[PDB]
Amino acid sequence: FXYXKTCX
Amino acid sequence: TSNAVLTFIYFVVCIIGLCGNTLVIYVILRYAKMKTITNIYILNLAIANELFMLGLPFLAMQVALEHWPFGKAICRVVMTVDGINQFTSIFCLTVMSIDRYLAVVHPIKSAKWRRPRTAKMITMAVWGVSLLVILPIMIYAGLRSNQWGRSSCTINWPGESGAWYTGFIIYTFILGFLVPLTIICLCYLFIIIKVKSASTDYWQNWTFGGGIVNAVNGSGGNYSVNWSNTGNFVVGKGWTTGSPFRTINYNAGVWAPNGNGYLTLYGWTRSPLIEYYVVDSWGTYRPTGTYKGTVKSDGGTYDIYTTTRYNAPSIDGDDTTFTQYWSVRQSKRPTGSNATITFTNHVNAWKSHGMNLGSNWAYQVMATEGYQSSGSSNVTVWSSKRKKSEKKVTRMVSIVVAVFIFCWLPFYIFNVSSVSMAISPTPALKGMFDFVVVLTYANSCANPILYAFLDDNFKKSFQNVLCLVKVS
């Protein structure tokens, strides 16, 4: 999901 | 850009958590006073948070460039450091609460266990299991690069992309949130029970008959009686649910009977129906019965007696028949200062004599009991008085646990929904993930701010260190 603890 | 805001937030969190958690690692290593059991657990929280606030600038620059440019070596260290912060952190908080449990609930039976050599030994065990837990992150940390040439630092699982995703989050959810909180919260259950059953909660004021009985319901476990009577009376404070392990404390500031009065602990069991007495002082008449033996408890020496009351009123009704177990001191107990009744010693004694108590515990009170007399008495009653020093520390951990749960639960909640998901992420959902993660990162700059608001010792150490003004 996203990539890691971040969606940009 | 939402990157702009996000990068700014990352950076201010990092600044604040670095100051916050360096000061905390400082004041504990620089003052003798600050080195305590709880503090030893706290240092490792601060170590883990510090380690993590160091990696944050790199993660901040990834968001700001939408590209990881630092390389695979620094990625492995940042993922290990981010993982340390997710599992070592709460693993320190669980050990902290178990420690709180043991020191409130079982102060007696684990004093040897609560020594700093055992804290230090335990805290090298907190790291070992964190590094075991984050082994998937350590082993599989690496760079993944998209078709447009931009690499993201992540955990490249070996199989299909989402195959290990649902596996992983459930592992992390169970290790980093479920099991530890299950542990933590029932620790504070049993602590709530021992805190709640320490003080008295039952007031009894039963005047039968003529005469004068002025009963006073004071603060805490305090009560007094002033009587010149012609009937029978029982006044006292105690517990609505007695216990055969409760050690009852009291202080009889005034115990001046003129006539028949008993100073005594007493109560009931049912199944079978038994009324019991531990008499410490009396008036002009020492109560007796069928002699049975002696017991030594709390400095003094008591005779054991049994009596049987036929067609007498009880807690079971107006006309029951039941046995009475008595421990009557052989001499009047000095009054005026703190006196203890270690109730177990009487229970054990009666048992060795084949007097067993009931399964079902009714009330258990420290009463003044007069029988056609005059007199005065002032008695304060309690059980296991709390240490104010220890209270505030158990309060601080409770609130550090609270903010942790608050800051992380939206994260585990967001992560567990995301396995079921069937539609590609929306900007609103993407903005929710980044907020929910920022919530976890912010957690590692709260703890210090809380130490200054919830521990006086941390507050003055912070003032000592940053040359601020101490004004009583």
Author numbering:
A (entry chain B): 2 to 9
B (entry chain A): 41 to 237, 1000 to 1184, 244 to 333
Question: Any passages from the paper?
Answer:
Somatostatin (SST), an inhibitory hormone that distributes widely in both human central nervous system and periphery tissues negatively regulates multiple hormone releases (growth hormone, glucagon, insulin, gastrin and cholecystokinin) and cell proliferation through SST receptors (SSTRs). There are five types of SSTRs, namely SSTR1–SSTR5, which are divided into two subfamilies: SRIF1 (SSTR2, SSTR3, SSTR5) and SRIF2 (SSTR1, SSTR4) based on phylogenetic, sequence homology and ligand binding profiles. Here, we report five structures of SSTR2 and SSTR4 in different states, including two crystal structures of SSTR2 in complex with a selective peptide antagonist and a non-peptide agonist, respectively, a cryo-electron microscopy (cryo-EM) structure of Gi1-bound SSTR2 in the presence of the endogenous ligand SST-14, as well as two cryo-EM structures of Gi1-bound SSTR4 in complex with SST-14 and a small-molecule agonist J-2156, respectively. The overall structures of SSTR2 and SSTR4 possess the canonical seven-transmembrane (7-TM) architecture with an extended helix VIII in parallel with the membrane.
To facilitate the lipidic cubic phase (LCP) crystallization of SSTR2 with its peptide antagonist CYN 154806, the flexible C-terminus was truncated to T359 and bacillus subtilis xylanase was inserted between S238 and G243 of the intracellular loop 3 (ICL3). Three mutations, D892.50N, V106ECL1E and S3168.47D (superscript numbers represent Ballesteros–Weinstein nomenclature), were introduced to improve protein yield and homogeneity. CYN 154806 (Ac-NO2-F5–d-C6–Y7–d-W8–K9–T10–C11–Y12-NH2, disulfide bridge: d-C6–C11, numbered as in SST-14) is a selective antagonist of SSTR2 and shares the same backbone with the octapeptide agonist octreotide (d-F5–C6–F7–d-W8–K9–T10–C11–T12-ol) with inverted chirality of the fifth and sixth residues. Structure superimposition with SST-14-bound SSTR2 indicates that CYN 154806 occupies a similar binding pocket to SST-14 in SSTR2 with different binding modes. K9 of CYN 154806 anchored in a similar environment and forms a salt bridge with D1223.32, a hydrogen bond with Q1263.36 and multiple hydrophobic interactions with F2726.51, V2987.39 and Y3027.43, as confirmed by our mutagenesis data. However, the main chain of d-W8–K9 pair in CYN 154806 rotates ~70 degrees counterclockwise around the Cα of K9 in comparison with SST-14, which may lead to an antagonist effect of CYN 154806. In terms of the conformational rotation of d-W8–K9 pair, the side chain of d-W8 is tilted with the main chain and inserts into a different hydrophobic pocket formed by M1193.29, T194ECL2, I195ECL2 and F2085.38, thus losing contact with helix VI that dominates the activation of class A GPCRs.
